[PDB]
């Protein structure tokens, strides 16, 4: 079946817990595979040690820039950027996992977890999974955001990997 992966997240050096994500490889296999491999670190790089750098309350929590840690960087397992696979899955509510980008066909490693329905991103960002477990952790992360996206705590993915 679809991969299950995890992110263990600290805030200011203390653990918040685990976010478990289902990756919809059935619908977006290339996008799911990128995220899966970045969680395991098996290509020699990935999310371990990187941050949630942009968090906006009542919107989303964004992470995955493991090169620049500021939202300008990141890279995929295929190359620096890769195409929008499809827009079949929609931003239907809290818990949606979707690719951050800088316009059409600029997927790398940055991603976000929605804390509300973000329907205006449909057809613009590739949704590729959702939160199976740990929405409590996501709500904690969300609470350390601001309107500008600047976080009020240092939010770090201390560990990550694949469960199945
Ligand atoms: N892949 C990717 C995702 C978000 C942003 C923002 N600037 N550059 C990016 C590149």
mmCIF file of N, CA, C and O in Angstrom, residues 55-147:
data_model
loop_
_atom_site.group_PDB
_atom_site.id
_atom_site.type_symbol
_atom_site.label_atom_id
_atom_site.label_comp_id
_atom_site.label_asym_id
_atom_site.label_seq_id
_atom_site.Cartn_x
_atom_site.Cartn_y
_atom_site.Cartn_z
ATOM 1 N N UNK A 55 5.317 29.489 9.303
ATOM 2 C CA UNK A 55 4.111 28.972 9.942
ATOM 3 C C UNK A 55 3.123 30.115 10.146
ATOM 4 O O UNK A 55 3.444 31.105 10.805
ATOM 5 N N UNK A 56 1.932 29.976 9.563
ATOM 6 C CA UNK A 56 0.908 31.018 9.609
ATOM 7 C C UNK A 56 -0.361 30.448 10.245
ATOM 8 O O UNK A 56 -0.978 29.539 9.681
ATOM 9 N N UNK A 57 -0.743 30.966 11.429
ATOM 10 C CA UNK A 57 -1.950 30.480 12.102
ATOM 11 C C UNK A 57 -3.203 30.582 11.236
ATOM 12 O O UNK A 57 -3.370 31.556 10.496
ATOM 13 N N UNK A 58 -4.056 29.563 11.333
ATOM 14 C CA UNK A 58 -5.265 29.432 10.514
ATOM 15 C C UNK A 58 -4.964 29.369 9.013
ATOM 16 O O UNK A 58 -5.786 29.775 8.191
ATOM 17 N N UNK A 59 -3.793 28.843 8.663
ATOM 18 C CA UNK A 59 -3.435 28.632 7.266
ATOM 19 C C UNK A 59 -2.623 27.339 7.105
ATOM 20 O O UNK A 59 -3.177 26.317 6.700
ATOM 21 N N UNK A 60 -1.334 27.368 7.438
ATOM 22 C CA UNK A 60 -0.459 26.227 7.159
ATOM 23 C C UNK A 60 0.861 26.273 7.925
ATOM 24 O O UNK A 60 1.277 27.323 8.418
ATOM 25 N N UNK A 61 1.514 25.115 8.005
ATOM 26 C CA UNK A 61 2.858 24.996 8.570
ATOM 27 C C UNK A 61 3.792 24.476 7.483
ATOM 28 O O UNK A 61 3.581 23.376 6.975
ATOM 29 N N UNK A 62 4.820 25.255 7.142
ATOM 30 C CA UNK A 62 5.703 24.949 6.010
ATOM 31 C C UNK A 62 7.124 24.622 6.468
ATOM 32 O O UNK A 62 7.674 25.287 7.347
ATOM 33 N N UNK A 63 7.709 23.609 5.834
ATOM 34 C CA UNK A 63 9.036 23.115 6.178
ATOM 35 C C UNK A 63 9.730 22.588 4.928
ATOM 36 O O UNK A 63 9.202 22.712 3.823
ATOM 37 N N UNK A 64 10.917 22.014 5.107
ATOM 38 C CA UNK A 64 11.569 21.243 4.050
ATOM 39 C C UNK A 64 12.724 21.890 3.312
ATOM 40 O O UNK A 64 13.272 21.276 2.401
ATOM 41 N N UNK A 65 13.099 23.115 3.679
ATOM 42 C CA UNK A 65 14.273 23.754 3.081
ATOM 43 C C UNK A 65 15.515 23.322 3.855
ATOM 44 O O UNK A 65 15.984 24.025 4.749
ATOM 45 N N UNK A 66 16.052 22.159 3.498
ATOM 46 C CA UNK A 66 17.198 21.599 4.222
ATOM 47 C C UNK A 66 18.548 22.089 3.696
ATOM 48 O O UNK A 66 19.590 21.698 4.222
ATOM 49 N N UNK A 67 18.530 22.947 2.676
ATOM 50 C CA UNK A 67 19.754 23.547 2.146
ATOM 51 C C UNK A 67 19.966 24.962 2.696
ATOM 52 O O UNK A 67 21.060 25.290 3.156
ATOM 53 N N UNK A 68 18.920 25.789 2.653
ATOM 54 C CA UNK A 68 19.009 27.192 3.092
ATOM 55 C C UNK A 68 18.235 27.535 4.372
ATOM 56 O O UNK A 68 18.431 28.614 4.942
ATOM 57 N N UNK A 69 17.349 26.642 4.808
ATOM 58 C CA UNK A 69 16.572 26.819 6.047
ATOM 59 C C UNK A 69 15.776 28.128 6.136
ATOM 60 O O UNK A 69 15.388 28.547 7.231
ATOM 61 N N UNK A 70 15.519 28.762 4.992
ATOM 62 C CA UNK A 70 14.819 30.051 4.965
ATOM 63 C C UNK A 70 13.662 30.153 3.967
ATOM 64 O O UNK A 70 12.971 31.172 3.932
ATOM 65 N N UNK A 71 13.445 29.107 3.171
ATOM 66 C CA UNK A 71 12.336 29.075 2.225
ATOM 67 C C UNK A 71 12.721 29.321 0.776
ATOM 68 O O UNK A 71 11.863 29.291 -0.102
ATOM 69 N N UNK A 72 14.005 29.560 0.516
ATOM 70 C CA UNK A 72 14.483 29.762 -0.855
ATOM 71 C C UNK A 72 15.053 28.487 -1.472
ATOM 72 O O UNK A 72 15.201 28.406 -2.692
ATOM 73 N N UNK A 73 15.368 27.500 -0.634
ATOM 74 C CA UNK A 73 16.139 26.338 -1.064
ATOM 75 C C UNK A 73 15.388 25.023 -1.068
ATOM 76 O O UNK A 73 14.172 24.981 -1.272
ATOM 77 N N UNK A 74 16.134 23.948 -0.830
ATOM 78 C CA UNK A 74 15.621 22.594 -0.956
ATOM 79 C C UNK A 74 15.932 22.018 -2.324
ATOM 80 O O UNK A 74 16.231 22.751 -3.267
ATOM 81 N N UNK A 75 15.870 20.696 -2.424
ATOM 82 C CA UNK A 75 16.080 19.992 -3.680
ATOM 83 C C UNK A 75 15.385 18.639 -3.623
ATOM 84 O O UNK A 75 15.165 18.096 -2.542
ATOM 85 N N UNK A 76 15.025 18.108 -4.786
ATOM 86 C CA UNK A 76 14.345 16.818 -4.860
ATOM 87 C C UNK A 76 15.355 15.699 -5.067
ATOM 88 O O UNK A 76 16.544 15.940 -5.291
ATOM 89 N N UNK A 77 14.873 14.465 -4.997
ATOM 90 C CA UNK A 77 15.723 13.312 -5.278
ATOM 91 C C UNK A 77 16.015 13.160 -6.779
ATOM 92 O O UNK A 77 16.842 12.340 -7.157
ATOM 93 N N UNK A 78 15.332 13.943 -7.617
ATOM 94 C CA UNK A 78 15.476 13.858 -9.077
ATOM 95 C C UNK A 78 16.415 14.908 -9.658
ATOM 96 O O UNK A 78 16.913 14.749 -10.771
ATOM 97 N N UNK A 79 16.629 15.984 -8.908
ATOM 98 C CA UNK A 79 17.294 17.184 -9.408
ATOM 99 C C UNK A 79 16.846 18.341 -8.542
ATOM 100 O O UNK A 79 16.183 18.130 -7.528
ATOM 101 N N UNK A 80 17.185 19.567 -8.923
ATOM 102 C CA UNK A 80 16.864 20.714 -8.070
ATOM 103 C C UNK A 80 15.356 20.944 -7.990
ATOM 104 O O UNK A 80 14.845 21.257 -6.918
ATOM 105 N N UNK A 81 14.657 20.772 -9.112
ATOM 106 C CA UNK A 81 13.208 20.973 -9.185
ATOM 107 C C UNK A 81 12.549 19.890 -10.041
ATOM 108 O O UNK A 81 13.210 19.274 -10.876
ATOM 109 N N UNK A 82 11.257 19.643 -9.827
ATOM 110 C CA UNK A 82 10.525 18.696 -10.669
ATOM 111 C C UNK A 82 9.081 19.143 -10.939
ATOM 112 O O UNK A 82 8.545 19.987 -10.222
ATOM 113 N N UNK A 83 8.465 18.614 -12.010
ATOM 114 C CA UNK A 83 7.153 19.110 -12.444
ATOM 115 C C UNK A 83 5.995 18.833 -11.492
ATOM 116 O O UNK A 83 6.067 17.932 -10.653
ATOM 117 N N UNK A 84 4.924 19.610 -11.652
ATOM 118 C CA UNK A 84 3.652 19.321 -10.999
ATOM 119 C C UNK A 84 3.101 18.042 -11.601
ATOM 120 O O UNK A 84 2.801 17.995 -12.796
ATOM 121 N N UNK A 85 2.975 17.005 -10.778
ATOM 122 C CA UNK A 85 2.590 15.684 -11.262
ATOM 123 C C UNK A 85 1.135 15.686 -11.725
ATOM 124 O O UNK A 85 0.830 15.282 -12.846
ATOM 125 N N UNK A 86 0.251 16.139 -10.843
ATOM 126 C CA UNK A 86 -1.146 16.409 -11.174
ATOM 127 C C UNK A 86 -1.773 17.189 -10.032
ATOM 128 O O UNK A 86 -1.147 17.362 -8.986
ATOM 129 N N UNK A 87 -2.999 17.658 -10.236
ATOM 130 C CA UNK A 87 -3.725 18.411 -9.215
ATOM 131 C C UNK A 87 -4.995 17.675 -8.790
ATOM 132 O O UNK A 87 -5.987 18.293 -8.405
ATOM 133 N N UNK A 88 -4.950 16.346 -8.835
ATOM 134 C CA UNK A 88 -6.140 15.532 -8.614
ATOM 135 C C UNK A 88 -6.654 15.600 -7.176
ATOM 136 O O UNK A 88 -7.858 15.747 -6.956
ATOM 137 N N UNK A 89 -5.754 15.496 -6.201
ATOM 138 C CA UNK A 89 -6.139 15.650 -4.795
ATOM 139 C C UNK A 89 -6.303 17.130 -4.478
ATOM 140 O O UNK A 89 -5.536 17.961 -4.958
ATOM 141 N N UNK A 90 -7.308 17.457 -3.670
ATOM 142 C CA UNK A 90 -7.632 18.849 -3.375
ATOM 143 C C UNK A 90 -7.308 19.234 -1.935
ATOM 144 O O UNK A 90 -7.152 18.377 -1.063
ATOM 145 N N UNK A 91 -7.193 20.539 -1.700
ATOM 146 C CA UNK A 91 -6.919 21.064 -0.368
ATOM 147 C C UNK A 91 -8.239 21.135 0.400
ATOM 148 O O UNK A 91 -8.850 22.196 0.509
ATOM 149 N N UNK A 92 -8.664 19.991 0.933
ATOM 150 C CA UNK A 92 -10.034 19.822 1.433
ATOM 151 C C UNK A 92 -10.247 20.237 2.889
ATOM 152 O O UNK A 92 -11.380 20.464 3.302
ATOM 153 N N UNK A 93 -9.174 20.319 3.669
ATOM 154 C CA UNK A 93 -9.302 20.675 5.078
ATOM 155 C C UNK A 93 -8.003 20.557 5.842
ATOM 156 O O UNK A 93 -6.949 20.320 5.248
ATOM 157 N N UNK A 94 -8.066 20.718 7.174
ATOM 158 C CA UNK A 94 -6.883 20.555 8.013
ATOM 159 C C UNK A 94 -6.281 19.159 7.867
ATOM 160 O O UNK A 94 -7.018 18.175 7.789
ATOM 161 N N UNK A 95 -4.954 19.088 7.822
ATOM 162 C CA UNK A 95 -4.242 17.818 7.723
ATOM 163 C C UNK A 95 -3.735 17.482 6.333
ATOM 164 O O UNK A 95 -2.975 16.534 6.172
ATOM 165 N N UNK A 96 -4.157 18.249 5.328
ATOM 166 C CA UNK A 96 -3.686 18.060 3.956
ATOM 167 C C UNK A 96 -2.184 18.346 3.863
ATOM 168 O O UNK A 96 -1.703 19.345 4.409
ATOM 169 N N UNK A 97 -1.465 17.452 3.182
ATOM 170 C CA UNK A 97 -0.026 17.582 2.929
ATOM 171 C C UNK A 97 0.172 17.932 1.458
ATOM 172 O O UNK A 97 -0.297 17.209 0.575
ATOM 173 N N UNK A 98 0.863 19.039 1.198
ATOM 174 C CA UNK A 98 0.955 19.599 -0.151
ATOM 175 C C UNK A 98 2.335 20.195 -0.399
ATOM 176 O O UNK A 98 3.022 20.579 0.545
ATOM 177 N N UNK A 99 2.745 20.249 -1.666
ATOM 178 C CA UNK A 99 4.062 20.776 -2.018
ATOM 179 C C UNK A 99 4.049 22.294 -2.075
ATOM 180 O O UNK A 99 3.173 22.891 -2.699
ATOM 181 N N UNK A 100 5.022 22.914 -1.415
ATOM 182 C CA UNK A 100 5.286 24.333 -1.602
ATOM 183 C C UNK A 100 5.967 24.490 -2.950
ATOM 184 O O UNK A 100 6.581 23.551 -3.457
ATOM 185 N N UNK A 101 5.848 25.670 -3.543
ATOM 186 C CA UNK A 101 6.499 25.936 -4.817
ATOM 187 C C UNK A 101 6.679 27.428 -5.042
ATOM 188 O O UNK A 101 6.259 28.244 -4.213
ATOM 189 N N UNK A 102 7.331 27.765 -6.151
ATOM 190 C CA UNK A 102 7.554 29.149 -6.555
ATOM 191 C C UNK A 102 6.928 29.384 -7.927
ATOM 192 O O UNK A 102 7.505 30.072 -8.769
ATOM 193 N N UNK A 103 5.736 28.826 -8.136
ATOM 194 C CA UNK A 103 5.063 28.862 -9.434
ATOM 195 C C UNK A 103 4.987 27.478 -10.059
ATOM 196 O O UNK A 103 5.415 26.495 -9.454
ATOM 197 N N UNK A 104 4.439 27.386 -11.281
ATOM 198 C CA UNK A 104 4.298 26.093 -11.946
ATOM 199 C C UNK A 104 5.610 25.323 -12.061
ATOM 200 O O UNK A 104 6.649 25.907 -12.371
ATOM 201 N N UNK A 105 5.546 24.023 -11.785
ATOM 202 C CA UNK A 105 6.665 23.103 -11.996
ATOM 203 C C UNK A 105 7.959 23.505 -11.287
ATOM 204 O O UNK A 105 9.047 23.472 -11.879
ATOM 205 N N UNK A 106 7.840 23.864 -10.010
ATOM 206 C CA UNK A 106 9.012 24.205 -9.196
ATOM 207 C C UNK A 106 8.995 23.469 -7.853
ATOM 208 O O UNK A 106 9.374 24.019 -6.815
ATOM 209 N N UNK A 107 8.576 22.209 -7.879
ATOM 210 C CA UNK A 107 8.598 21.381 -6.680
ATOM 211 C C UNK A 107 10.033 20.988 -6.375
ATOM 212 O O UNK A 107 10.794 20.685 -7.287
ATOM 213 N N UNK A 108 10.410 21.020 -5.101
ATOM 214 C CA UNK A 108 11.744 20.603 -4.682
ATOM 215 C C UNK A 108 11.619 19.675 -3.500
ATOM 216 O O UNK A 108 11.367 18.478 -3.662
ATOM 217 N N UNK A 109 11.787 20.236 -2.307
ATOM 218 C CA UNK A 109 11.571 19.500 -1.066
ATOM 219 C C UNK A 109 10.643 20.210 -0.086
ATOM 220 O O UNK A 109 10.177 19.591 0.861
ATOM 221 N N UNK A 110 10.365 21.496 -0.297
ATOM 222 C CA UNK A 110 9.529 22.226 0.643
ATOM 223 C C UNK A 110 8.084 21.759 0.539
ATOM 224 O O UNK A 110 7.567 21.502 -0.556
ATOM 225 N N UNK A 111 7.442 21.665 1.697
ATOM 226 C CA UNK A 111 6.080 21.163 1.806
ATOM 227 C C UNK A 111 5.351 21.906 2.910
ATOM 228 O O UNK A 111 5.973 22.585 3.727
ATOM 229 N N UNK A 112 4.032 21.773 2.930
ATOM 230 C CA UNK A 112 3.245 22.322 4.022
ATOM 231 C C UNK A 112 2.114 21.393 4.431
ATOM 232 O O UNK A 112 1.648 20.566 3.643
ATOM 233 N N UNK A 113 1.710 21.529 5.691
ATOM 234 C CA UNK A 113 0.550 20.843 6.231
ATOM 235 C C UNK A 113 -0.488 21.918 6.516
ATOM 236 O O UNK A 113 -0.210 22.876 7.240
ATOM 237 N N UNK A 114 -1.669 21.777 5.924
ATOM 238 C CA UNK A 114 -2.738 22.754 6.101
ATOM 239 C C UNK A 114 -3.394 22.613 7.465
ATOM 240 O O UNK A 114 -3.541 21.505 7.982
ATOM 241 N N UNK A 115 -3.786 23.744 8.043
ATOM 242 C CA UNK A 115 -4.559 23.754 9.282
ATOM 243 C C UNK A 115 -6.000 24.230 9.051
ATOM 244 O O UNK A 115 -6.784 24.330 9.997
ATOM 245 N N UNK A 116 -6.330 24.510 7.791
ATOM 246 C CA UNK A 116 -7.679 24.864 7.353
ATOM 247 C C UNK A 116 -7.864 24.347 5.925
ATOM 248 O O UNK A 116 -6.902 23.895 5.298
ATOM 249 N N UNK A 117 -9.087 24.428 5.406
ATOM 250 C CA UNK A 117 -9.332 24.205 3.980
ATOM 251 C C UNK A 117 -8.703 25.365 3.211
ATOM 252 O O UNK A 117 -9.042 26.521 3.460
ATOM 253 N N UNK A 118 -7.775 25.062 2.306
ATOM 254 C CA UNK A 118 -7.117 26.093 1.497
ATOM 255 C C UNK A 118 -7.447 25.893 0.012
ATOM 256 O O UNK A 118 -6.569 25.594 -0.804
ATOM 257 N N UNK A 119 -8.720 26.080 -0.334
ATOM 258 C CA UNK A 119 -9.216 25.702 -1.662
ATOM 259 C C UNK A 119 -8.607 26.506 -2.810
ATOM 260 O O UNK A 119 -8.532 26.013 -3.931
ATOM 261 N N UNK A 120 -8.153 27.724 -2.525
ATOM 262 C CA UNK A 120 -7.534 28.579 -3.538
ATOM 263 C C UNK A 120 -6.194 28.039 -4.057
ATOM 264 O O UNK A 120 -5.703 28.491 -5.093
ATOM 265 N N UNK A 121 -5.608 27.081 -3.342
ATOM 266 C CA UNK A 121 -4.375 26.433 -3.790
ATOM 267 C C UNK A 121 -4.635 25.247 -4.732
ATOM 268 O O UNK A 121 -3.695 24.716 -5.331
ATOM 269 N N UNK A 122 -5.897 24.842 -4.877
ATOM 270 C CA UNK A 122 -6.255 23.780 -5.819
ATOM 271 C C UNK A 122 -5.840 24.181 -7.233
ATOM 272 O O UNK A 122 -6.111 25.300 -7.674
ATOM 273 N N UNK A 123 -5.174 23.270 -7.937
ATOM 274 C CA UNK A 123 -4.694 23.545 -9.288
ATOM 275 C C UNK A 123 -3.384 24.311 -9.340
ATOM 276 O O UNK A 123 -2.879 24.602 -10.424
ATOM 277 N N UNK A 124 -2.832 24.644 -8.174
ATOM 278 C CA UNK A 124 -1.577 25.391 -8.095
ATOM 279 C C UNK A 124 -0.503 24.654 -7.289
ATOM 280 O O UNK A 124 0.682 24.743 -7.609
ATOM 281 N N UNK A 125 -0.920 23.941 -6.244
ATOM 282 C CA UNK A 125 -0.010 23.119 -5.451
ATOM 283 C C UNK A 125 -0.436 21.662 -5.508
ATOM 284 O O UNK A 125 -1.628 21.358 -5.452
ATOM 285 N N UNK A 126 0.546 20.772 -5.616
ATOM 286 C CA UNK A 126 0.295 19.343 -5.693
ATOM 287 C C UNK A 126 0.096 18.756 -4.293
ATOM 288 O O UNK A 126 1.034 18.687 -3.494
ATOM 289 N N UNK A 127 -1.136 18.347 -4.006
ATOM 290 C CA UNK A 127 -1.446 17.618 -2.780
ATOM 291 C C UNK A 127 -0.984 16.174 -2.955
ATOM 292 O O UNK A 127 -1.230 15.565 -3.998
ATOM 293 N N UNK A 128 -0.295 15.631 -1.951
ATOM 294 C CA UNK A 128 0.242 14.274 -2.059
ATOM 295 C C UNK A 128 0.089 13.405 -0.809
ATOM 296 O O UNK A 128 0.669 12.327 -0.734
ATOM 297 N N UNK A 129 -0.709 13.851 0.153
ATOM 298 C CA UNK A 129 -0.951 13.050 1.343
ATOM 299 C C UNK A 129 -1.734 13.782 2.405
ATOM 300 O O UNK A 129 -2.295 14.855 2.157
ATOM 301 N N UNK A 130 -1.760 13.197 3.598
ATOM 302 C CA UNK A 130 -2.438 13.807 4.728
ATOM 303 C C UNK A 130 -1.931 13.242 6.049
ATOM 304 O O UNK A 130 -1.252 12.215 6.086
ATOM 305 N N UNK A 131 -2.285 13.927 7.131
ATOM 306 C CA UNK A 131 -1.912 13.521 8.480
ATOM 307 C C UNK A 131 -2.766 12.343 8.959
ATOM 308 O O UNK A 131 -3.991 12.443 9.042
ATOM 309 N N UNK A 132 -2.097 11.235 9.269
ATOM 310 C CA UNK A 132 -2.726 10.031 9.826
ATOM 311 C C UNK A 132 -2.864 10.161 11.343
ATOM 312 O O UNK A 132 -3.881 9.773 11.934
ATOM 313 N N UNK A 133 -1.818 10.708 11.954
ATOM 314 C CA UNK A 133 -1.698 10.840 13.397
ATOM 315 C C UNK A 133 -0.839 12.065 13.697
ATOM 316 O O UNK A 133 0.069 12.395 12.929
ATOM 317 N N UNK A 134 -1.132 12.748 14.800
ATOM 318 C CA UNK A 134 -0.301 13.858 15.256
ATOM 319 C C UNK A 134 -0.796 15.240 14.874
ATOM 320 O O UNK A 134 -0.007 16.182 14.807
ATOM 321 N N UNK A 135 -2.096 15.392 14.642
ATOM 322 C CA UNK A 135 -2.633 16.725 14.406
ATOM 323 C C UNK A 135 -2.432 17.611 15.642
ATOM 324 O O UNK A 135 -2.300 18.826 15.515
ATOM 325 N N UNK A 136 -2.389 17.008 16.831
ATOM 326 C CA UNK A 136 -2.043 17.757 18.042
ATOM 327 C C UNK A 136 -0.665 18.416 17.925
ATOM 328 O O UNK A 136 -0.479 19.555 18.356
ATOM 329 N N UNK A 137 0.293 17.712 17.325
ATOM 330 C CA UNK A 137 1.624 18.273 17.103
ATOM 331 C C UNK A 137 1.559 19.413 16.081
ATOM 332 O O UNK A 137 2.209 20.443 16.255
ATOM 333 N N UNK A 138 0.769 19.225 15.025
ATOM 334 C CA UNK A 138 0.590 20.256 14.002
ATOM 335 C C UNK A 138 -0.041 21.522 14.595
ATOM 336 O O UNK A 138 0.380 22.632 14.273
ATOM 337 N N UNK A 139 -1.031 21.355 15.470
ATOM 338 C CA UNK A 139 -1.660 22.502 16.135
ATOM 339 C C UNK A 139 -0.672 23.229 17.056
ATOM 340 O O UNK A 139 -0.700 24.458 17.151
ATOM 341 N N UNK A 140 0.211 22.480 17.716
ATOM 342 C CA UNK A 140 1.279 23.097 18.503
ATOM 343 C C UNK A 140 2.192 23.932 17.606
ATOM 344 O O UNK A 140 2.447 25.106 17.890
ATOM 345 N N UNK A 141 2.664 23.336 16.512
ATOM 346 C CA UNK A 141 3.512 24.051 15.552
ATOM 347 C C UNK A 141 2.805 25.325 15.072
ATOM 348 O O UNK A 141 3.390 26.409 15.072
ATOM 349 N N UNK A 142 1.543 25.180 14.675
ATOM 350 C CA UNK A 142 0.716 26.303 14.218
ATOM 351 C C UNK A 142 0.685 27.450 15.233
ATOM 352 O O UNK A 142 0.780 28.625 14.856
ATOM 353 N N UNK A 143 0.556 27.102 16.514
ATOM 354 C CA UNK A 143 0.476 28.100 17.585
ATOM 355 C C UNK A 143 1.774 28.893 17.775
ATOM 356 O O UNK A 143 1.765 29.941 18.427
ATOM 357 N N UNK A 144 2.880 28.399 17.218
ATOM 358 C CA UNK A 144 4.159 29.113 17.269
ATOM 359 C C UNK A 144 4.441 29.918 15.995
ATOM 360 O O UNK A 144 5.564 30.386 15.792
ATOM 361 N N UNK A 145 3.425 30.085 15.152
ATOM 362 C CA UNK A 145 3.543 30.893 13.944
ATOM 363 C C UNK A 145 3.177 32.347 14.175
ATOM 364 O O UNK A 145 2.986 32.781 15.313
ATOM 365 N N UNK A 146 3.080 33.095 13.080
ATOM 366 C CA UNK A 146 2.643 34.489 13.111
ATOM 367 C C UNK A 146 2.072 34.852 11.745
ATOM 368 O O UNK A 146 2.196 34.082 10.795
ATOM 369 N N UNK A 147 1.453 36.024 11.642
ATOM 370 C CA UNK A 147 0.866 36.461 10.375
ATOM 371 C C UNK A 147 1.905 36.550 9.250
ATOM 372 O O UNK A 147 1.601 36.226 8.103
#
